[PDB]
Each structure stands twice: as structure tokens, then as C-alpha cells.
Amino acid sequence: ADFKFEPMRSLIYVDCVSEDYRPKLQRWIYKVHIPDSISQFEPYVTKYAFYPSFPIPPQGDRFGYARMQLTEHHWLVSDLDPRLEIKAIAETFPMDVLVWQGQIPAAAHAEGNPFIFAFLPMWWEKDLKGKGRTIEDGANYRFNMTIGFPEGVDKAEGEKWLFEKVVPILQAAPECTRVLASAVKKDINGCVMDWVLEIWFENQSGWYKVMVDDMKALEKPSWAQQDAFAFLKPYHNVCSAAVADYTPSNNLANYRGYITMR
Amino acid sequence: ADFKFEPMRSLIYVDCVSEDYRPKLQRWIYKVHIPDSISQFEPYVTKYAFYPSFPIPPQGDRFGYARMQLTEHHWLVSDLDPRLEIKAIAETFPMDVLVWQGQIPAAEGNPFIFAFLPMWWEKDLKGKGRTIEDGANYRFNMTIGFPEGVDKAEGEKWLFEKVVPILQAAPECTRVLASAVKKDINGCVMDWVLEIWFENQSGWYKVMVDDMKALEKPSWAQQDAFAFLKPYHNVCSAAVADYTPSNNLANYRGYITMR
Amino acid sequence: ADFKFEPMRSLIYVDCVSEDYRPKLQRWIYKVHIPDSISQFEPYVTKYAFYPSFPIPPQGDRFGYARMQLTEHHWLVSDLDPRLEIKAIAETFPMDVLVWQGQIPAAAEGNPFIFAFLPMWWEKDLKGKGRTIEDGANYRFNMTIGFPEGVDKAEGEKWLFEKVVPILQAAPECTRVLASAVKKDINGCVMDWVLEIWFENQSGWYKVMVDDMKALEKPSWAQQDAFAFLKPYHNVCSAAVADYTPSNNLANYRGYITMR
Amino acid sequence: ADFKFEPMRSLIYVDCVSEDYRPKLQRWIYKVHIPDSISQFEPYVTKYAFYPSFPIPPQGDRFGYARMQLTEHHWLVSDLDPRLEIKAIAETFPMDVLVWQGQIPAAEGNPFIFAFLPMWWEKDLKGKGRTIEDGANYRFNMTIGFPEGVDKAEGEKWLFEKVVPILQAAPECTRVLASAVKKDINGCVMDWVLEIWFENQSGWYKVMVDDMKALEKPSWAQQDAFAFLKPYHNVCSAAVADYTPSNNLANYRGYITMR
Amino acid sequence: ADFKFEPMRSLIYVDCVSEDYRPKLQRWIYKVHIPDSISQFEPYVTKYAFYPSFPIPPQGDRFGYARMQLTEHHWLVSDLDPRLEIKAIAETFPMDVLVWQGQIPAAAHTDAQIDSDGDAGNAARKSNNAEGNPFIFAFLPMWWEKDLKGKGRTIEDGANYRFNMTIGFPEGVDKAEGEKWLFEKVVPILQAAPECTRVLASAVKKDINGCVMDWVLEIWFENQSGWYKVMVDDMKALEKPSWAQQDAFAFLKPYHNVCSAAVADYTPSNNLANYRGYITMR
Amino acid sequence: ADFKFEPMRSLIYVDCVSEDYRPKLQRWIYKVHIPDSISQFEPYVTKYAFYPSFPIPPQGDRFGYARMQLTEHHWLVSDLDPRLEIKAIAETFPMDVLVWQGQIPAEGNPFIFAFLPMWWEKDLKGKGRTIEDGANYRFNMTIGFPEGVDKAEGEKWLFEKVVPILQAAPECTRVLASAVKKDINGCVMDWVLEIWFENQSGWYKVMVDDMKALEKPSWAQQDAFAFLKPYHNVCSAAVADYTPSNNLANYRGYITMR
Ligand SMILES: [Cl-]
Ligand SMILES: [Cl-]
Ligand SMILES: [Cl-]
Ligand SMILES: [Cl-]
Ligand SMILES: [Cl-]
Ligand SMILES: [Cl-]
Ligand SMILES: [Cl-]
Ligand SMILES: [Cl-]
Ligand SMILES: [Cl-]
Ligand SMILES: [Cl-]
Ligand SMILES: [Cl-]
Ligand SMILES: [Cl-]
Ligand SMILES: [Cl-]
Ligand SMILES: [Cl-]
Numbered sequence A: 001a002d003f004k005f006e007p008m009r010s011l012i013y014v015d016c017v018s019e020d021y022r023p024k025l026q027r028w029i030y031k032v033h034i035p036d037s038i039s040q041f042e043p044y045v046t047k048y049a050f051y052p053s054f055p056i057p058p059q060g061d062r063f064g065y066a067r068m069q070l071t072e073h074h075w076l077v078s079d080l081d082p083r084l085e086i087k088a089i090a091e092t093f094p095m096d097v098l099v100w101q102g103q104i105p106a107a108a109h110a111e112g113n114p115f116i117f118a119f120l121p122m123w124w125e126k127d128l129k130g131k132g133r134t135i136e137d138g139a140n141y142r143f144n145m146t147i148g149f150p151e152g153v154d155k156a157e158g159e160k161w162l163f164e165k166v167v168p169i170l171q172a173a174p175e176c177t178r179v180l181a182s183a184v185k186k187d188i189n190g191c192v193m194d195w196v197l198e199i200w201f202e203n204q205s206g207w208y209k210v211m212v213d214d215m216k217a218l219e220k221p222s223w224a225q226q227d228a229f230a231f232l233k234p235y236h237n238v239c240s241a242a243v244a245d246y247t248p249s250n251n252l253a254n255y256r257g258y259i260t261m262r
Numbered sequence B, D: 001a002d003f004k005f006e007p008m009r010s011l012i013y014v015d016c017v018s019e020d021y022r023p024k025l026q027r028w029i030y031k032v033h034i035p036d037s038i039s040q041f042e043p044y045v046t047k048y049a050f051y052p053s054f055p056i057p058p059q060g061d062r063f064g065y066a067r068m069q070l071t072e073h074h075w076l077v078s079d080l081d082p083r084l085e086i087k088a089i090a091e092t093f094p095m096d097v098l099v100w101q102g103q104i105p106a107a108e109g110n111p112f113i114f115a116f117l118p119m120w121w122e123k124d125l126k127g128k129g130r131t132i133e134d135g136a137n138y139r140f141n142m143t144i145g146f147p148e149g150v151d152k153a154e155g156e157k158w159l160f161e162k163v164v165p166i167l168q169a170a171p172e173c174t175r176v177l178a179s180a181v182k183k184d185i186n187g188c189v190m191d192w193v194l195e196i197w198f199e200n201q202s203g204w205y206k207v208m209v210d211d212m213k214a215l216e217k218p219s220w221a222q223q224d225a226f227a228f229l230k231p232y233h234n235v236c237s238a239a240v241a242d243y244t245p246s247n248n249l250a251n252y253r254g255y256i257t258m259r
Numbered sequence C: 001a002d003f004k005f006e007p008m009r010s011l012i013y014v015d016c017v018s019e020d021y022r023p024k025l026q027r028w029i030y031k032v033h034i035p036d037s038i039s040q041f042e043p044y045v046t047k048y049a050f051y052p053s054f055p056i057p058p059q060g061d062r063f064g065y066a067r068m069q070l071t072e073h074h075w076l077v078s079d080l081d082p083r084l085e086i087k088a089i090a091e092t093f094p095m096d097v098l099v100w101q102g103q104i105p106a107a108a109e110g111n112p113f114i115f116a117f118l119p120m121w122w123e124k125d126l127k128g129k130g131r132t133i134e135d136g137a138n139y140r141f142n143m144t145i146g147f148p149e150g151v152d153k154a155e156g157e158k159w160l161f162e163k164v165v166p167i168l169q170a171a172p173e174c175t176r177v178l179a180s181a182v183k184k185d186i187n188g189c190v191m192d193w194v195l196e197i198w199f200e201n202q203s204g205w206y207k208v209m210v211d212d213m214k215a216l217e218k219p220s221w222a223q224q225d226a227f228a229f230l231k232p233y234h235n236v237c238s239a240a241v242a243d244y245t246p247s248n249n250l251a252n253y254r255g256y257i258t259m260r
Numbered sequence E: 001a002d003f004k005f006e007p008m009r010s011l012i013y014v015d016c017v018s019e020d021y022r023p024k025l026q027r028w029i030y031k032v033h034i035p036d037s038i039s040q041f042e043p044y045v046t047k048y049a050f051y052p053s054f055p056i057p058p059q060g061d062r063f064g065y066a067r068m069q070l071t072e073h074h075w076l077v078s079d080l081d082p083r084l085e086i087k088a089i090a091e092t093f094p095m096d097v098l099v100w101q102g103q104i105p106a107a108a109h110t111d112a113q114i115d116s117d118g119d120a121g122n123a124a125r126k127s128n129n130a131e132g133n134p135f136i137f138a139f140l141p142m143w144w145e146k147d148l149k150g151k152g153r154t155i156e157d158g159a160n161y162r163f164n165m166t167i168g169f170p171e172g173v174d175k176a177e178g179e180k181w182l183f184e185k186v187v188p189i190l191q192a193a194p195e196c197t198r199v200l201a202s203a204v205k206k207d208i209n210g211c212v213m214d215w216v217l218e219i220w221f222e223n224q225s226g227w228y229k230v231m232v233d234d235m236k237a238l239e240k241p242s243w244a245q246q247d248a249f250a251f252l253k254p255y256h257n258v259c260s261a262a263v264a265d266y267t268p269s270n271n272l273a274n275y276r277g278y279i280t281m282r
Numbered sequence F: 001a002d003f004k005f006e007p008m009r010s011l012i013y014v015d016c017v018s019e020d021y022r023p024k025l026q027r028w029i030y031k032v033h034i035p036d037s038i039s040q041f042e043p044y045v046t047k048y049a050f051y052p053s054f055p056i057p058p059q060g061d062r063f064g065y066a067r068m069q070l071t072e073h074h075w076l077v078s079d080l081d082p083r084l085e086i087k088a089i090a091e092t093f094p095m096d097v098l099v100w101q102g103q104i105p106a107e108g109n110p111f112i113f114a115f116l117p118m119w120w121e122k123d124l125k126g127k128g129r130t131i132e133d134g135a136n137y138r139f140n141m142t143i144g145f146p147e148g149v150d151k152a153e154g155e156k157w158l159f160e161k162v163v164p165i166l167q168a169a170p171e172c173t174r175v176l177a178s179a180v181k182k183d184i185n186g187c188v189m190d191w192v193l194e195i196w197f198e199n200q201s202g203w204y205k206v207m208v209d210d211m212k213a214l215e216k217p218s219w220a221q222q223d224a225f226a227f228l229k230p231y232h233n234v235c236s237a238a239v240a241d242y243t244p245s246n247n248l249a250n251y252r253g254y255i256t257m258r
């Protein structure tokens, strides 16, 4: 049977719940996970990249801040087609990776956080501020944020709140240079998230001024899961990362094995 | 909504209207344009390449000869789908570039010719089976579009029944390939792209200038001799080699400068 | 007209019928064939690789063992679409290549050029699901079979999956069994199935594919007395290869650099 | 005259004194500095890499912790040979870079520390035979330079008879390597570079902070606790991973921007 | 015996004497010569690049303008050490290449491999046919010896029309006399011209391969007009030397005693990093 | 102290003593050894490559034929300088590798690691041959005269008795040779030669049949040429002109077949 052409970009929000885990998680990612992944999807993924996150900003924990990276894939076909479950060689994936990313608590003496894997079209659906901005305009502090409204909130009500109450605050702030948004493709993998936005600042201070201070003017919604914006449960209904314009980890082009420092 | 699988090869005819503009145009192309472009389309363009024009031959001006390069993309989706208009980072594009390329004049402008095609030539009209072992080719790539009010079928018939037979008869001409331009993509004015190979510039001249003198001048003619079309507006062209070092998705490593 | 999105993996079973041809065939492949091929299909083939064969095992000749390599392509469109026949530069492909590969005999008869198209993902996972590269090196025995003319395809299929595979499953020396139906509609390949069957090494391969298969009964359509009961190089081709190849050509080729 | 074969490894400790500067400094490093650097030294530098620092650990400020990266070069000739001062194209360098790194304060500064070493560690004092299969390392690279008028041999003795044994005794520390700085190349004030491995940040702290409390404070001390040297001036450091994707001569493909 | 560490940069001035030869010469260069060269010297050459020439400017012929490219190598050892004459695989080097480049006149049977008692490529690169133009292969230190104008210029200051020129004073002319003329008469004209943004120069290492050239300069302009204004118009002011081989600057015999090329800041042909075989257009 | 500039090419003759070891040895070579090696010497080795051996020819065992590969390094400094013994990260090298290569039984064969100058010292046949002249079957062979045998006398035998047989044979298209640098690492080998043929049959006709004309020297360790103890005093491999495993330029990690 045919395979459908389904160009998509996906984002995974990779946390690191303790600095003591960073070396181990980073090693698995760069030494094990890259070669396993490329081995599987080289023929139908056109780009595979990691964007390490900037240091977590003040109150970043309230936004489900991914303390390791964003992982980005560009797919030509849906990875969740059941026919794609079969692979010659399966990923080497230690259970400890779930500990390091916070999906399960360590057995030593934290509630677990879900694996958030959001599929999107390759092109942003909404361009809400900063159209025409070029790389010549300067370095961006790019705050990539995904949200999913809690169970029993009408999705249209959530959409309307996002674009009529939240985005306008972003748009008004001179500190914010770009707002982009796309609806999550929920039909692919059942992701609980509903929207991905990217919101650019000059720097962390700008991010804080708008995303913490300006957002205080918002009414607390009846569905709120925390007292302040985003009013959503960290790492379950909101995840995020702030990243640079460029990454050296463009894996299909740049990987040459796990060469170690001398 | 879905995106349609739409594999295409596109050609842009990049001119440089004065030699004094050459260093500047070339810098923008290789230092600024390449990375902006790869940044946008890496996930859905499988090949992005520049083929620098050979030196403009005698009377090449009459063929809308592109004095910088051919720019070639291979697309998996239509770049003109309205959804593709939104981009995080827009290309750095000074108005000067349009001057250097001649889109805005010294004197009327020359249009930006961006012709979409299928990935595979639709007509193999001469030299089927030529291999790279048969020798270096002087590859003359030419696009033409019939003027306002000329019936496209009459234009087509002229091309394939009058023009091509002359190329077929010349032993200087080793290859003739053609495709109809995909007009549905971007409203390109051009109607056909052809590639016509010779051994060298003299061969090109013998066939495209002298042998073509035998053609009768069409009633729609916009200049006195073949291609009888308005240079840079209804005909563009470049002669290029078989190989380019500028296969950009594979070969680019940043703008490293000479020591 | 439209071009259909048709993602596929293809395998070509490349023999070298005499050791004296190896340097010539190998030169053509790596010096001439690679750049011609990349030139043609770079924009719509996402992977192009060669997997050199391990040394032919005992009785490998009975399995149509390809003594040069497997050639693997991953396609986005069908290469057999007639619109794809046209190309600016044709491949430099002297008939000597078909002599070296055994398509044209020395002067028994020629062996067919076996070019099998498949889905990109294996259709059946029959043993060893979950195996990772960490579980160790594999002797990967890739085999394609085509039932003889006049054998009902469903009958052949039933034989393969009801009789042959259970023997593979029974053998601890066999760590993986994968299979896909050949896409016959693309290019008319005579083969019906491609399987890949992993062992630890040649001795394991032999114990199962030769000794354990003696328990099979000889089918009425047999073209040889022992499994695979099919005509070597005509109705069965194979190769044993490693997990990794350096010849991942769209990523790794830098021209024909010669040893000093 | 001849050029001397002088294979060396150098390290630069690159700080970022405020998070608000990170995006600008990183952009300059990766968009501008890389191609300028490669342009100049490609023919005589065999490796050029950046190792981004792990998040500054607690009390890391007292160790002159570089909050951006280590920059590492492998040289075939001395970059301080006066004949190498001449360059067709000079590096693009906004003054602001010195602010971002803390060399000059925002309108006292910290010096630019650029230490040359042999390509191979001179002393292997703990963990000989450790391979990459034994696990991920928290690699703490530290350079120290004894203050004005402290006898170098007395400093050395202190380092190797008092400091290193604490490292050798700590199970949390898996590796100790050291080389003397080549002071004759560029006047670097540093005297030693050590690299000291741990499993993680907490191990680092246990050893470099807690265990070192047993040391007697030297009479030359510039701060109360180990390393007893002035942060950023007489001691700099960074903790880095075993691997970097920024192996610049092999891996750089231009400043491709996120979509 | 030891091999001496001898880091050097070399330049070859590659002409193409007729446009009809261009496709053939360019094919040999990119299809045949690249892989042969990399195969031989990958272990001791750290950079190997081609910088295609800008279109020959007006009066460029009087400057020995290389109408194909500059070929540039960076060496760690001298390619002229006699021990380096031995090579497992020799360059495929038809005589046609010397025809296309102007080293020898057109003749029958020049598709033949070049002849030599030693190596064909090493002999091809010492070509000095009385009837053609010699093969100019100049060794230099890796770093310019003199920085005469434009110190501190960055790539941010703009695109350069880089005119690279080599000169060799005729037989009989005192080298010190020539040097003084160059640096006290010629260079000051370049220095005085606002159109000229950079002047760099090095002495040719003559001890390596007996190259006839004595100096390599690189002189930058904004463009072809600026080059012309300075190298043709401003240079009319110079008095003609008694040793002159032509009436106007550089007063040297084109292609024999002066060669040159104008090139861009960047080339895509950085061959050790960027070559992926001779992929042909579709 | 200074490091000396010492450009060299080295060869290692890598055997595989049983086909059942091949998948494991090859995995180790390509998955573990490559990155460990590059991690150590990237800054001072300009080339690192493997040339997989052609299938062992008849009587190849008498030439210490390497059934896995030749490993080639080009060094800028001597790897045997004791200062280079120190490495931050050591290589992962289990004793199994020595079993697979035949250095130890499960006395075995020595590890043969020969340093040469980067350029062949002697060009004895086929000077001028280009790659356009055709594919070569390149027989690379290193020999070391037994204990007690005078080196000059061995040398004379090689260049005056053996080589002229190669020169006379039209099947042999190239003869190159260099003296092994014995000062670097104590290698017992004295010469490396490379001898080209069109193919295996040509190799055999010359190296087996034509060499029967040679008198058995008094120091002979086997009855026929090369008269040296296989794997101990003669090793070899036959290889192609090209290898895809040019490791510093071509390696992208251990990507596995799907
Ligand atoms: Cl923590
Ligand atoms: Cl709260
Ligand atoms: Cl002009
Ligand atoms: Cl503008
Ligand atoms: Cl007219
Ligand atoms: Cl060939
Ligand atoms: Cl039988
Ligand atoms: Cl801060
Ligand atoms: Cl400034
Ligand atoms: Cl203090
Ligand atoms: Cl001409
Ligand atoms: Cl400019
Ligand atoms: Cl003279
Ligand atoms: Cl004159």
C-alpha cells in the first residue's frame, strides 16, 4: 500500500533534571542516539538537529524549561505509520535516560514528566509579529514554547484566549521582536499539546520582562493550573526552551563520530 | 491541510550588467545568499547549485545571456504554495542586488526569470546516449517565451519544426533537450527551456548565429535575427560546463577568504 | 502530469564471476559508476550505498552468492516511470561489466541482473525483534527468492512461511529474520521475496542454512536437490554482509583517490 | 629564513560575564570568528575546536570559570612569530566582544588568557588507561599562575606535593593530567594547565571545594580558599564534556539559521 | 635522511589561450587533475585551491593575465626535493594541457602523456618552450613579507578585486636595482591611489625550483575600472626603464616576465575540503 | 623540548585467522578503533586509511597474507617518542582482537608495524604509469631477514636475484621499494616492496611459478620463495588502487544497515 507524503517538522523538549546527570545524558545523546537515529531514518528524514538550550532563566521552571535541548526532525512521512514500527536494528536506550530527562523519578531517596513530541507543518502557520526580520537584524533569544490546555477546556476557548489575550501582550512589548505560531498536528501521535509558539527577545532580561512581568496583567483563567502565566502545569501542559539562531549539531551534515577531547 | 508532492527543477538566469558590479554581486551570492537559502529550504530542497556562465560569446547579448550564473534548485514541494511565504528568518536582500542583476535599470529593467520544470527533460531530441566519456560539453541552456498575443501552439510548432531541425542537421551540435515550463507555478513568462550542446563557443556561434540565418523571420519577431525575441525579456540563456564546484548543500563551508 | 511519491528501497545483487575480474569491476564501480549515478539521481534518491560481501561461505554458490556487493538505493519516485528514461548524461557502462558480473557468459549461460524493489520498511519481523547494535556484530545473510515459472505464488509463499521460516526460528544460531514481498509492478523482477537472516558468523549460517534445512522435504518444483531448491543466480541470489559500510556514497565519496 | 616546526596545543578561556550578552557573543563566535580564523590559519593549524562550558558550578566564580567555552587550537608553527603578524584579511572584531568576555568593563577587567602547551600531556598523575567506554567525564580544565615574586619551583612543589595528592586520594576524581605552560611563546602569566576529571558537578565540588579545605593557606594567597589565586587573573577554568560538535575545520558549514 | 620542514605557499598562473579550449581545459582540471593531485600530496599539503580568474580586463593581455585560474598550494615540505620525484601513480597529463595553457603551440598527437626522464607533472611545470609561454610556478612563504597599504582591512570592509601579479626582471638586470624600482617608483603610485585598498608583496623563493619570477604582489581594488585607472592610467607617469621589454608598465614581457590574475576573496574550489568527484549537470 | 618533524608513512598488516572472527574484528575496527584513533592523533597524522585485502590468493598463506587489511598512517612526528605515550583517553583494545588477528592463540604471530618515508625510495619498474593505464592488483609485501643473516647480503639477494625476475615478467607492471625505518620502533622487517599485477593469476604466475627458478638460499625458512617464515618474516596484502575508508575525511560514525 502507498505511503503518504507528509512533510512535517517535529520538536521534542529534552530536559535534564539534575546537573549531575548532564554528562551522562549528553553522552548518550551524542554518542549513542545520533548514530542509532540516523541509521533508522536517513532515507526519509531531511534534517535532524539539536538546539542546546540557553541557561534556564529566572522562573523558567514554571514554563517546563528543557534544560538540555530541543531535538528537531524534518520528516517526509509520518513516523507513526504502523508500518514504520519495524526496524532491523532498534535504538540502544537505557532506562536511565528516562531518569535523566525526568520521565521517571530516580529509585534513590519528583513526579514524572511526559515525553513531549510535537508534530507541526514545516512552515509556521501564523506570523504575528516581526515579518521581514533578517539575520542581519541581530542575534535572537528564541523562546520556543508549547502549550496544551487541560482536560475539559474547550479548545476553541483556549485558542481564543491565546490569540486575543496572550499574544497581544507579546505584540505590544518592544522587547519582543518575533511571534510565530502553529497548531500541533494531534492526529499524528496524540500529543497533548495544542500550540507551538516561538517568541523572540534580545536577551533573557527581555524574556523575563514580557513573559513574567507584562503577563501579570492577565486575568487568571478558571482552568488555571498555576497562579501565573502560563497558568499551565509545568512540563505536562507547558514546555519550552530558549535557543540560539544557530546550532553546530546539524546531525545529518555535521556528525563525524564521537571524537573525544585530548 | 496536505502538501502536494511536487518534484521540480527550477532555473534562474542571473545576469551581471557591469563588470564593476561583479565582485559585489558574487560576494552577496556566496557570502549572504547561500546560507540564507539553505537556512530556509534545507528540509525540502534536495539540491541547490550554481553554474557560472562561461564568458559571454559573440552576439550572446541577443540571447539574454546571463553573465553571472544559472541558479538551480530541485524542489520536493512548490515554493509558490502560499503557506511557504511565512519564514522565521527572511533573506538579506539589498536593493543593490537588483541593480547588479539588471532588474532595476542604469534603460528599462530586465525581469527576474525563474522557470520551474519537471526534474527530467520531456524531450530528448538529439544525442541520446551521450556519456561523460564522450567529452567536455559547452552546454547552452536557453529559455524562450512567445510574445503577448502569439498563440502558444503556433510558437511550439515553429520551435520544434523550424528551429530544432537546424540543430539536428549541424554536426557541431551534440545534444538537444527540451521541457515545457511549468507556467502554473509562478506565472513565468517563459514557455520552453532547451539545452543545446556544442564542443565550444565557435560551434555555438556557427549553429546559433550562422545556420539560423536561414530561418524566415516570424511576423511576431521582436528582433531581426534568431531567437527573434526580446533579449532578457523573452529569451534568456547561459553557456555552462558539465561540472560546478558550487553544489551548495554538499560543498559549502562558509565564506573562507583567500590569504 | 504528476509524479507519484513512491518511497522504496532497492537491492541489486552484484556478483564477480572470477577473481581476475575483481580489480576491473571494482574500479568501474567506484571510479565510474558512483559519479554517473549520483549525477543522475541526487535530487530524488536519499541514500545510495554499497555493502561488500563477506567471503563466499561453503556452498554459497548454491544460493547465488554475490561475490562483489549489494547495491542499495532509497528512492522517492519510481525509477521505472517512463519519464525517467530521459537523461542528459547517460552512464558510462561498457558491456565488459556484464561479463565481470556474470550477466554475459565467458564464451554455461548468463545470470540475470537482479534488481529488486521493496518498501523502505520490512513488512514482516519474524525473529529477533528488539535487537540493538549493542547486542553484537551480525553476519547478515540477505537472500532473495523467485518461484519457478508455473508455481502458484500463494503456494510458494505458504511454503516459505509455513515450512522454511520455522526452521530459522528453531535455530538459536539465527538471531534475526526479516522479510518483504518484492514489488513486482515496478520493474518486472522475477524475485518474489527478500529476506534477511542474521547469524553470528559463517559457521552458524552453515549449520542452519545447510544442515538444519536438510529436514525440509524436496518440493515438487525444486530446481536443485537442497534448500533453497531454486536455481542459483536465477531464482535465488544472496550475500552476507556486515552491519556497517564505509561506502555510503551520497555522504562519503570524494572522488577516486589513489593509494600512494 | 626558516620557520620552526613547533607543534603546540593552545587553550583560551572564554567567559561571558552576563547572560544578556550570551546571544551576541555566541553569534560573533560562530557567525564571524570561525570563518575569519579558518581563513587565516587553515594551512598550519590541524585542529580548531570549541568546547562549550557546562553550567558554572557552585563557587566556580572563585576558579575563574569561563562561562562560554574553551577554544582549542593545534598549531604546527608558533602563532607569535612576528612574521605571522601580517594577514591579508584581518579578523572582524567589535570592541564589544571584550565587554562580553569581561576584558573591559561595561561603559576592573580580566585578562585574555591564551596558554600554549605541548600537544601531549607532560604528567599523567591519575587514571592512566581510562577509555571512553568507562563513562562520561566532567572534565575540569584549570590553569593557574603563581603571583608576582613567588618562586616558581616553590609553587610547583606545592602543586605536586600538596594539591595533587588530595586529588589522588579522592575516589570522586578519575583523572589528573598536567603540563607546564610554554611561557616563552606569548608571555602568558599562567604556569600550569591541569585537567581533573570527575563523574559530575557534585564530585567536583566535594573534591575541589570540601577536600581542599585541608590545605594550609599559603603565604602568597590571593583568596582564602583553594586555589588561593585571583579569579580570572591567576586562575581560569572550565568544565567540559568529552565531545564537541564544534570541531571547526571538519564540521563548519556556515551560519545556518533555525527555521 | 631527514625531510626539512619547509612550509610554503605556491602559485601557478594558469592561462587558457582560446575560448574554444576552455571546456576541455576546465574538464581536465576538475575531473582528472584534482584527484591525481590529492592522491599524491594529501599527506603533506594542507591546502590546495583554485581561484578562477575574473574576466580579463582591458589591457590585461599586457600583464600575462591567466584566463583560467590561479592554482594555490600550501606545502609542509619542498615539492622539489629530488626524493619526491618518485610517485606510485603519476599524473595523467596529456600534452594538450600545455597547448590549452599556451606553454606550447598546437600540434598533432598532443593527447599523448607528457614525456620526461623524471616525473611528467614536475617536467610539465618547468615548461619553457621558446615558441610558447613558460610554466610559472612560484614558491612563497605562507605569510606576506611586506604589508605596504591597507593593514587592518577586514572582510567587512567589502568585496575586493584582488589583482595578484608576479614579475621577473630580465636577464642582465641587477636584482637590487629592480627591487628598488619596484618599491620606490611603482609601489608609491599604488599607495597614492584611493582606488587601491591593499598592497602586499613577498620575494619569490628562487632556491626551490628556479622560478624566473622575483616578486609576487597582490594589489586590491574595488573593481575593474579602479584596476585600470591605477595600473594603466596612473602608471603612465613612470619613466620607461632602460631594460623595458614593452612600452608601458609593467615594461616586462607578458607571460614570460609578468603574469597575473584578478580574483575574488572566496573560491568554492577549496579542493581538500570540498571536492566530491565530477558530478555532472542533469 | 622540541619535537622533531618526521614525516613518515606506516603500514600495519592486519590478519583475520578465521572467518568466524571476521564480523567481530571488522566491527571492532570500524566501530571502536577508528574513533579511538582519530581522537588521539587528529592533530599530527595527516592521513589514516584502511585498504581491505583482496581474497587471499593461492599460496598466499606462504606470504603471511593479511586477510583483513593494511592500515596506513601518515605521521608528522614519530609515534614512538616516549612523550607520546601519554593520552587523556586510551583506546579500547581487548585481548580478543589479538586472537582474531592471530597474535595470540585462543606462540602466535607478531604485530608488524613498519615505518617508512612518505615517498618510495626505489622505483624499479613501471615509472610513469598513470591511473588511466588500468586497475592494479597491488601486492604489498614486507620482508625481514632471519636472525644472523647479514643485511647487506640480504639486500643484494633482493635487488640482484629477486627483482630482475619481476622486471622480466610482463605480468608485473610496477616495482617499488623502501627500507623500513628500524630506528623508530624495532620492527624486524627490512624492506617494504609493492609489486603490481593485472590480477591474481598474474600475481601467481610471477610470485610462485617464475620464482621457482631461484636458488634456495642457505638461510631459507621455507622451501619456496620468499624463503621466509610466514607472518613472522614476511607479511603481505593485495589491495586495490582505491579505498572508501579514508578515515580522517570519510568517517561519519557507525551507521548500520536498515
Ligand atoms: Cl542539580
Ligand atoms: Cl502556583
Ligand atoms: Cl562593463
Ligand atoms: Cl536595501
Ligand atoms: Cl534587431
Ligand atoms: Cl576509467
Ligand atoms: Cl542439485
Ligand atoms: Cl547575569
Ligand atoms: Cl567596534
Ligand atoms: Cl577570599
Ligand atoms: Cl578566442
Ligand atoms: Cl560590498
Ligand atoms: Cl630575459
Ligand atoms: Cl610595446
Ligand SMILES: [Cl-]
Pocket: F149, F150, F151, F152
Ligand atoms: Cl647486518
Ligand SMILES: [Cl-]
Pocket: F221, F222, F223, F224
Ligand atoms: Cl616449506
